[PDB]
Design a binder for this molecule. Structure first.
Ligand SMILES: O=P(O)(O)O[C@@H]1[C@@H](OP(=O)(O)O)[C@H](OP(=O)(O)O)[C@@H](O)[C@@H](O)[C@H]1OP(=O)(O)O
Ligand SMILES: [K+]
Ligand SMILES: [K+]
Ligand SMILES: [Zn+2]
Lengths: 369, 69
């Protein structure tokens, strides 16, 4: 029935951010490995993806910022001290070999996905390499250099009057929210841990948009330890009413796996099944769908999450047992698709808090009829 | 035949397998990686520089293919 395009870049995983850095591009290699060994490619149109140029990128980002990303290298940094500070490169966003190639590679696939949805080449396009939602017009942020999401949504807007952006990463999708804050042509919905200066420190419930974009931006701020059932209890009602009221002609879903229990950076308690319930619910609306990756810092769990979500998107029930492959040992000791990722830590989201949250969200939603 | 002009992969498994078949590291290469690594951990830029037929991306790939085994 549904045509699913899947972008497989054999090279996009062969990068390393540096010693100590939680972002591991090779998590994309593990994901592809499992996706292929499960035979899921048989249900998808698999593309070696387009690579984005500065021309593509500068439809959103500044010319000098992108220029700097091409110019800076591990060996020439000493002469770029002021630029590193100005462009916010060097800390969360380090200089590593192949930085620009990696950006071009992940962005390109997002853009091609948008392009194929526009052309009705497919119903669902998947780029696990994309979804770097923090990057701003002229600064790097939060492990993200180029905001492939905004670039992709710009492309969708050529044909789509209304684009719904849904962000499931544990972090507030601030870069996407900023780019589109003043317009009603993209509605940004973000669920995230908020409070106690947890990065990026924004995505307060009162951030609802401005100018003609007032009420076309929605933030759901959560505390530590949210579980499947509680998350589902918010997510499904909110999204259902967003779709009804806003009537998007296209959806962009950022599927950051750092909202899983036992994530290296995250403090949520979602299972792989719970996270997949969100993806499947978005799929149920039968609206053209661009599916992106994003955060995810327990490599072994990230690869499995996105593999399982691939199988859902393709409507294929795959075995709990992982097939043997070059990365089999990464999945020790269980070697299973659905390991226990429970935090076994107390959920900080009281019923009162969630209802106080619930009531302000639906009040905001009322403004769109 | 396995990849079209426009990048459509007719046989994605064959494409993937091809990348593993090109796991052609000699013992001089293998040994240089290790010594350069323990000296400079995860400095794959530096490691690649001491390897005539290995780039920084191949070094990253080798690291992940072997760091268990
Ligand atoms: O999950 P992996 O990426 O395979 O390995 C990371 C390792 O990252 P690498 O650079 O080897 O991919 C990571 O290294 P770093 O401290 O440099 O991020 C370890 O801390 C630990 O989480 C380690 O995880 P562990 O093997 O589960 O302890
Ligand atoms: K989010
Ligand atoms: K907006
Ligand atoms: Zn995140």
């Amino acid at each position: 029935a549904k045509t699913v395009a899947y972008f497989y870049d054999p090279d996009v995983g062969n990068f390393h951010y540096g010693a100590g850095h939680p972002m591991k591009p090779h998590r994309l290699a593990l994901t592809h490995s499992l996706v292929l060994h499960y035979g899921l490619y048989k249900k998808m149109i698999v593309f070696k993806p387009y690579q984005a140029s500065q021309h593509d990128m500068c439809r959103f980002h500044s010319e000098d910022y992108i220029d700097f990303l091409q110019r800076v290298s591990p060996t020439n940094m000493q002469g770029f001290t002021k630029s590193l500070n100005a462009f916010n490169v060097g800390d969360d966003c380090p200089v590593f070999p192949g930085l620009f190639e990696f950006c071009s590679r992940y962005t390109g696939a997002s853009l091609q996905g948008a392009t194929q949805l526009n052309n009705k080449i497919c119903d669902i396009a998947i780029n696990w390499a994309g979804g770097l939602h923090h990057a701003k017009k002229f600064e790097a942020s939060g492990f993200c250099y180029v905001n492939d999401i905004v670039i992709g949504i710009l492309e969708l807007l050529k044909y789509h009057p209304r684009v719904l952006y849904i962000d499931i990463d544990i972090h507030h999708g601030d870069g996407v929210q900023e780019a589109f804050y003043l317009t009603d042509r993209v509605m940004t919905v973000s669920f995230h841990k908020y409070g106690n200066y947890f990065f990026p420190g924004t995505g307060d419930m009162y951030e609802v948009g401005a100018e003609s974009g007032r009420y076309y931006c929605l933030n759901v701020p959560l505390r530590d330890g949210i579980d499947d059932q509680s998350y589902k209890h918010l997510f499904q009602p909110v999204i259902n009413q967003v779709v009804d009221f806003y009537q998007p002609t296209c959806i962009v879903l950022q599927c950051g796996a750092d909202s899983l229990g036992c994530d290296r950076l995250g403090c949520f308690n979602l299972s792989i099944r719970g996270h997949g319930e969100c993806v499947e619910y978005v799929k149920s609306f039968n609206i053209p769908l661009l599916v992106l990756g994003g955060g995810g810092y327990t490599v072994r769990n990230v690869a499995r999450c996105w593999t399982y979500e691939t199988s859902l998107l393709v409507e294929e029930a795959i075995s709990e047992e992982l097939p043997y492959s070059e990365y089999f040992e990464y999945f020790a000791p269980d070697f299973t698709l659905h390991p226990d990722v429970s935090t076994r830590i107390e959920n900080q989201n009281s019923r009162q808090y969630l209802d106080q949250i619930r009531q302000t969200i639906f009040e905001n939603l009322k403004m769109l009829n | 035949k396995f990849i079209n002009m426009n990048g459509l992969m007719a046989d994605p498994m064959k494409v993937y397998k091809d990348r593993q078949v090109m796991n052609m590291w000699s013992e001089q290469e293998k040994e240089t990686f290790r010594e350069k690594f323990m000296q400079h951990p995860k400095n794959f830029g530096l490691i690649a520089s001491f390897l005539e037929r290995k780039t920084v991306a191949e070094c990253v790939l080798y690291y992940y293919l072997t760091k268990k085994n």
